[PDB]
Amino acid sequence: LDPLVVGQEHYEIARAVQNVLQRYKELKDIIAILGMDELAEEDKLVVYRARKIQRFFSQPFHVAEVFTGAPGKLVPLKETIRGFKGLLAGEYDHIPEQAFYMVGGIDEVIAKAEKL
Amino acid sequence: LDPLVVGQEHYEIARAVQNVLQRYKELKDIIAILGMDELAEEDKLVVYRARKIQRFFSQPFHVAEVFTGAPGKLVPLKETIRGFKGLLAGEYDHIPEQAFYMVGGIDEVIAKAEKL
Amino acid sequence: LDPLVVGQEHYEIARAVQNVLQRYKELKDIIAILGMDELAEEDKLVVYRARKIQRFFSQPFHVAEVFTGAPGKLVPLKETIRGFKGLLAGEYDHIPEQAFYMVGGIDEVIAKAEKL
Amino acid sequence: ATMQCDVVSVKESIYSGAVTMLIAKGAGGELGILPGHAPLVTLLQPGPIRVLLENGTEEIVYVSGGVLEVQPHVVTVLADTAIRADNLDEAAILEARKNAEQLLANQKSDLDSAAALAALAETAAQLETIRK
Amino acid sequence: IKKLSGGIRTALAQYRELAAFAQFASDLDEATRKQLEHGQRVTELMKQKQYAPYSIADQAVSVYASNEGYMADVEVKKIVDFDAALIAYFRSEYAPLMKQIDETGDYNKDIEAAIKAGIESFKATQTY
Amino acid sequence: ANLKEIRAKVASIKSTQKITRAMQMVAASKMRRAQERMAQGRPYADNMRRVIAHLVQANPEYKHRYMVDRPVKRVGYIIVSSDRGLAGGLNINLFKKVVQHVKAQQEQSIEVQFALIGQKAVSFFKNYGGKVLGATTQIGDAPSLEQLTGSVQVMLDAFDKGELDRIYLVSNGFVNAMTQKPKVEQLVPLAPAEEGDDLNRTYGWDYIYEPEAEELLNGLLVRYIESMVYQGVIENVACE
């Protein structure tokens, strides 16, 4: 995970995601003890984006098709990069987070959101 | 030390004494870190009773008179049972913990309470 | 540093400057917190005496004669004892500071104080 | 007619809308549909107050006592949590004679005037307490 | 047993989570206080004497009485006495049911109804 | 050291850490509840300010004995403090601020007296000594007026007899969850500051003052006297 081997945009996206996750880890305790809200908007946006990313990390597998019945999803890297860049940009600030759970690729998120 | 060998009262007395002492043992670190006033009232009662009980196990011996000069003592079992039952009940609380050192049976504790 | 081997005079002269050093070390934080203005009486004098003695510990060396105008000093032990006793007595308190710095013996320090 | 009538005690309030009929003693039950005139201030008696908001909804509010101010479209009451409107002084300091200075006197008998005494000692105690 | 073990596991975990709040119980909200009380009851239910093995029916009845709200009225110090009395009330008035549970191990709505009715009868009539 | 000693010490520190975390959570809950109480009590202070401004604008010709200031002599103070420790030394800060204040007052050559409400002030600050009129302690959280009614009354009756002139109150003020700072404020002189309100918009009718034209209002002051001090006290509790 260095700018030379993998590239510049991939490195930037990965570092931004890790920074957001670390920020969320720092903020949960303040919500837990000091209280809910009582905070600026940027922190709240960070929390919402972190929750969306956490939901989006999960994906169904192919070795569990005979158990659950849902087909497996193999996502090409480019799709992951595009989806995470779009999520970090803020375009999907209105999509419900429940559409990010076990949904595979980004367009599929859009289809599940519009269907719901 | 079995309820079918020493009876029922003896077993309960021994278990209660051991429980009180063990509970007091775990409170030393909190008192070291936190003030003595920062404890529950029941914890304070446990600490005081444990100190009284700890002093109460000491008696003068007939053989060690050369070391101290006090005459020896010999306490029957029933007196010990009655004294410990009275102590765990909460009576004997006003009596200072000093009067429980090397004093044989309880009645000598009551008598010694006058002096010191 | 034992009264039997070196003498009671030298021993009592010692362990008195070390007390001043320890007091100054303990007061350093308070001196760091704020200056002599917060400091009370009988501690400003301690601070001044500690500074004076710690500057008086300096001495020119003959080995540095290449870089020293003076040829260095060889102070006799009795002179050092006299100077330290006089400075501990508080007589040399009115002597301005920095006159004990790199001036070697106290007798030379007096001349340096007089000239500047 | 009636829009609001606020009664505030140490930490509480109530809301009044279009009150039909309000009953307070010592004033003939002056309160009721808002008079809105002759703004004034009176000493509210420690008797209870009966409130009828609308269509006969009756309720009782207990006032220990306090001050009542009326003005066009404004009714304000500053009440007391206990019976103290009589400006009691000796009774309210009887416990002070036993708990205010008597408690300190048993605890500390120095009875020495301060005049910022031993300020050096206070500073030294401050320095000792700083160490942590 | 597989059906009924989850409630005990969850209660023990939640008691492990919050236990230092025992002194400060009054300052907590209702939910956490109830969780702490349930954890205390459960952790005192686990105590047992030597040379007295429990049967599958006995364990099932005890766990069912605990998972439901039946042991929320008894005092924290009297839980051990209440548990045995309840066991001895069964095997004397409901022995067929105990034998069926011991021999089969099944769990159907019919068994649950019988266990609930027996527990209600014990809580209503007998005393501990 | 021995391996056993370290092995036991680690577990002891873990248990103490759990206990301290529980104490922190309890303190957070108590602090937020105290904030709720402060928000609830603020409108009472606001309406008190409104009514006193309205009355003083209504009858500025006559002023009671509490709005007249004589030359400063024999000043008095009021102190509030916690009854328990582990507070990081806010009581220490309050005591030090008041002691430099009284040191300056003594440099002005005026003797002082004061009263205490906090247990720590009586237990620790009084070993040194000091003229004291009243000390009430163990009022607890959510203290009631009955509890502090006497303590304020004796301090101000000392002013009423004239043997004290100026009375200040010293208490902590809460600016943010991490920010509390000592404050000293004079109340008995009750000098006016904001009197521009209600003059620009009618409010010229004033009151018929039927029960007493210029007599009952003094009692109002007493209520104000018992209000602000109370309003101060809860403040400190929250800060604590």
Curated annotation (Swiss-Prot), chain E:
Any coiled-coil regions, as ranges: none
Annotated localization: Cell inner membrane
Source superkingdom: Bacteria
Main function: Produces ATP from ADP in the presence of a proton gradient across the membrane. The alpha chain is a regulatory subunit.
Subunit structure: F-type ATPases have 2 components, CF(1) - the catalytic core - and CF(0) - the membrane proton channel. CF(1) has five subunits: alpha(3), beta(3), gamma(1), delta(1), epsilon(1). CF(0) has three main subunits: a(1), b(2) and c(9-12). The alpha and beta chains form an alternating ring which encloses part of the gamma chain. CF(1) is attached to CF(0) by a central stalk formed by the gamma and epsilon chains, while a peripheral stalk is formed by the delta and b chains.
Family statement: Belongs to the ATPase alpha/beta chains family.
UniProt name for this protein: ATP synthase subunit alpha
Organism: Acinetobacter baumannii (strain ATCC 17978 / DSM 105126 / CIP 53.77 / LMG 1025 / NCDC KC755 / 5377)
UniProtKB/Swiss-Prot annotation, chain F:
Membrane topology according to the record: Peripheral membrane protein
GO CC annotation: plasma membrane; proton-transporting ATP synthase complex
GO biological process: proton motive force-driven plasma membrane ATP synthesis
One Gene Ontology molecular-function label: proton-transporting ATP synthase activity, rotational mechanism
Family the entry assigns: Belongs to the ATPase gamma chain family.
Quaternary context: F-type ATPases have 2 components, CF(1) - the catalytic core - and CF(0) - the membrane proton channel. CF(1) has five subunits: alpha(3), beta(3), gamma(1), delta(1), epsilon(1). CF(0) has three main subunits: a, b and c.
Entry protein name: ATP synthase gamma chain
Keyword Cell inner membrane: yes
UniProt keyword Acetylation, yes or no: no
Location in the cell: Cell inner membrane
Domain of life: Bacteria
Known role: Produces ATP from ADP in the presence of a proton gradient across the membrane. The gamma chain is believed to be important in regulating ATPase activity and the flow of protons through the CF(0) complex.
